[PDB]
Symmetry: D2
Subunit: 359 residues, 4 copies
């Protein structure tokens, strides 16, 4: 019910960076630099610009000091300077608020368009960016937990099919989703760059930002992040994992930054770049869909997510999801999940797997 514009979609390459507003810049720096090992492209008393090991654009993450922690912008790189004009035309036809800045909104980005999209998310589209030293062979800097690439964003929105259509019109291709037999959709994953996703929609009250994900080379790198957090005695900031995903098949970990922005560490999903890439739909009650090993999904993973800002820097209104809740139908008092479809053995009723109930 979001209409398809007559205007052509901008050619989107990939997710490129997020700008997160943080309340204590020093504490945030400790987390992203000292704990996680991201590389400083620029910093001052107001902002920190960070990039992953293999990145050549200026940054994958901007930490901006502000009064209220929130997503300020989720930025996608487009293929040509002309695609920025295409983005402006497209969103204007959709009736969305847009703001164009020839000199960019943040350092290291040139001509850029920010929009309040039809789902209420602050999207940025840009082509021009300052190239920096690509650190991909700087093994003298490589940490045991090295984050090598920015992989994806994940957005919380109340109406998944509505957002899905809009993103498909924008050119994203759906790779996987979670539905039930009653026809409710709980989540969808969609890509531009030929991995499982560049962004994803998670059913819930929104707009809110669920997480930003970075890649590692190997599974042991993700294990090391966990181990380091234990050594630093901040294991309470490990939210969920590590595990193997069902959807995406990636090895994963979720952690919480000082403002409770959720960061995923992710590795080893599969190639999706063929236009007839087979879509995979999982049943919501399948206990292997989110954690392949059947480990329970922590309730905060379903309930907590970051505020997002509008173009004035104010927090966007949040709309209540009315479709069924994934938490409620799977691990809530009236929920259930299964290990084998139709088998009562290895099924869980009114609680989570592995012997746990909701706290």
């Amino acid at each position: 019910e979001i209409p398809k514009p007559v205007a052509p979609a901008p050619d989107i390459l990939r997710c490129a960076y997020a700008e997160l507003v943080v309340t204590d810049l020093a504490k945030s720096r400790n987390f992203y630099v000292d704990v996680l090992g991201l590389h400083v492209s620029y910093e001052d008393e107001n902002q920190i610009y960070l990039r992953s090991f293999e990145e050549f654009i200026h940054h994958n993450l901007v930490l901006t000091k502000g009064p209220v922690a929130a997503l300020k912008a989720m930025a996608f790189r487009v293929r040509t300077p002309e695609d920025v004009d295409k983005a402006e035309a497209y969103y204007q036809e959709l009736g969305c608020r847009t703001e164009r800045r020839k000199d960019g909104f943040v350092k290291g980005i040139g001509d850029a368009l920010r929009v309040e999209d039809p789902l209420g998310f602050p999207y940025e589209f840009f082509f021009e960016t300052t190239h920096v030293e690509r650190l991909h062979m700087r093994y003298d800097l490589y940490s045991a937990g090295e984050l090598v690439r920015l992989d994806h964003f994940n957005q919380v929105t109340p109406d998944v099919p509505r957002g899905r259509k809009y993103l498909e019109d924008l050119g994203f291709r759906v790779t996987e989703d979670i539905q039930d037999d009653e026809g409710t959709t709980y989540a969808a994953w969609m890509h531009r760059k030929g991995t499982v996703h560049d962004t994803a929609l998670t059913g819930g009250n929104g707009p809110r930002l669920h997480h930003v994900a970075f890649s590692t080379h190997e599974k042991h790198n993700i294990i090391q992040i966990c181990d380091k957090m234990g050594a630093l005695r901040i294991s309470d900031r490990i939210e969920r994992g590590p595990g193997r995903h069902g959807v995406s098949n990636a090895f994963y970990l979720y952690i919480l930054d000082p403002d409770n922005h959720r960061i995923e560490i992710y590795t080893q999903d599969y190639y999706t770049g063929d236009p007839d890439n087979p879509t995979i739909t999982w049943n919501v009650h399948d206990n292997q869909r989110r954690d392949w090993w059947g480990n329970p999904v922590v309730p905060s993973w379903y309930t907590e997510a970051s505020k997002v800002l509008d173009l004035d820097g104010n927090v966007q209104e949040i709309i209540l999801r009315t479709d069924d809740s994934e938490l409620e139908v799977t691990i809530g008092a009236d929920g259930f999940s299964f290990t084998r479809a139709g088998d009562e053995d290895g099924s869980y009723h009114g609680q989570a797997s592995k012997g746990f109930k909701l706290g």
Copy 2:
């Protein structure tokens, strides 16, 4: 208190094998051979003899068909044939029932002594064993989840200090333990071979066998076992993990065989062979002690363990623990755990970590 014999202790080398009684031999074979990749030394309609990748003695695990699933014997290899006589003399002085078989109790073992030890456990001591092809460079057989060694046993016993003193007199050296500030001991780890342990005591109703542990070379091998279990749609048989242990520092996984016998997969603990190896005591309320990443300990891990048999093949009666319960004091309704000692932030009152309560 268990008295220290005048008779010298047998010189114990290491844990060597366990004999488990199973109810359906074919189903057990599916689990240990097809799922886990253990190597068959001998089998018939009654027994299956299995060994790990780097083993040169006949077997590390004997599966015996029987009416009641239980541990039949935990076996330790001794240094010399004369140590079998030393074990006989030792246990006779302790007033324990012993049985001696010059040609062994199981195939591929020679002169062997089985005892009902002071804690009610069926111990075996042997030297003589049939050597087999050591498969350590048979990379043509190497599985993505290859189990390379037998590492340890873990025993459930009601009175940990009582058992600890007995095992110390036997020559085992304590490497780590869990205590509280009120004089209660919850668990102890003890070795002969220079790893963290060859056996361990876990406080609880006993005698019961908590688990048998096998090692892999690398952490990814353990991940693969989990992954394979999800592919076989038996993720319900993954009990706990994978994780990083606090005590022992090993990467770990617990899975359940078809008779609910618990198997741990384990890797990368540290060297303990020096006689003044520093002992490490963890506080029971430290939420990083069992899983370093603070993931909750599944309640079945505290409550479930295997029956053990006497020398007549009858199940040993269960003596109740009267000391405080680790489950109750950490994750029960009146329990408590912390992330940082003295910090209310990251502490848990009357529930488990990560947002869960007992199911």
Copy 3:
């Protein structure tokens, strides 16, 4: 010198499969299925169709029994059925011999175009292919050395700049190359799918096929392949490696099949999908350009490669390279290489690194 056609280039997605002629089908099957663990999509007495772990198209490799071992076709998948028509028009404009088969040249491929390209290589373009079960989460089938994707081809051609221009016009983007200060180009790498390459040009006598490359998830998987070849006592079929590439930054291994077709195993190169991806040029004398650790490049790696066929099944005549030889200028009697530019310490003159000369 190879002119740019007026007709538009077909939109090429990625390298998709190679068809290799082999002399003994059973022996080839032993190598690719038994040693390397590729998955059989179809086989009969004349052909074996194989795919990698994550593939959903019918196959990545066709082994065809024939009198003379050679490359029969290197196939690229195109975006739409119409791009096959575009491919036909494009190559007909170039004056190349083309053959079109509405029902394909091999099983599981539909409408297909094969061409004898300007460099004398048998290229195939197709869209239509039979989808098969994507094995990406079949961890019950996963090998310790599992080959997960087809990554690239590598072609030997006498004139690298000539081939480079042609491939760029065809839409490949150069990511890395090797040159010297005189202005000779020794090698170039070029992509469509957003990895370091889908094909590459190696300077030498040609047309010949240097290798076909498959990916693994992790570096340990490549180590396992070497270990397994040791156990099978076929270590003489390990040609070069394992190592870390300078160009591409990938961890690698080269092995030889029963007909001396070279196969590379490859993992963890970087993202190239942005249109302004920085192009890296290495100096031919840089001893870290091919193996980052400075290990010598085996002479057979520069001199040996597979014959290629024309459309009638006859071997293509070889044209000699007149440009300087990478072998000669680096490891030959009058060659040299350096560890640090301008430093004689760590330089090698008239021999290879690590204390070796040419055999």
Copy 4:
């Protein structure tokens, strides 16, 4: 022949540390600390004391500034303080020069005996050592190339059987060796701590120290060391590897410190603690004995080794080997090696494997 003393051998636990004389302390610090990540236990202007990640004794390596780079002492820890007395009596009965210091030769060591042993090597025996923080869970300090333990020494000596008998009398157990069909022994490996070795003898002119070896947890940690040396543009200091050993089965790498002291990085050998541990003899012409993958052994690996000092700090005179040279018989002009015994295919005559000759 070296006679077996009447006096009992000291009970040796393990190799514990090496004291190396270096010419430029700062440069040596840059290598061991900044490149390799060893942990500083103590330093001043004359010496640097270093330990591995899991070590609790004071140090595994002492770097001592001096005029001539050499091994000053190879130290073994003994079981009790009385074993130092036993070591003194033992070497005194052997007619060896001994020096006893009640307060040690280096910091963090107590009562210590140094000897000029029968093969000319400076051995130390000690029990007393200052315990330090065991860093085994300090994942906040863990390097991507972390060295976790000291594993072994390797000694060059002209007569391997003579040295072997002496070490066996001292209580070391031979695990593997290399011989030919004409009765020549080229190398032997022997242990106390239950790994493949604590020291080893390599046939050649001696006494010289071949190398000191440290362990990592995993194979990727060794790969990272290579990658970091490439990044630092010191790949010319990678002498040999990385590879899989035949003898020992360990994954390995050899690198050279600023004074050309050879250091091995080593992981994942097997358990040898049983007293009937199967001994393994390899033929010297077996091309998988040293590198399992058949990669050629660098000639410098056979010819170069460190000087060793006597108790006055003077360099020990070299005695020439008269037995056949492993280099000459395998890779020399008249050498030979095989891949499969009895198979001419995959054999090498008068040159090294993989297409190389001696430089």
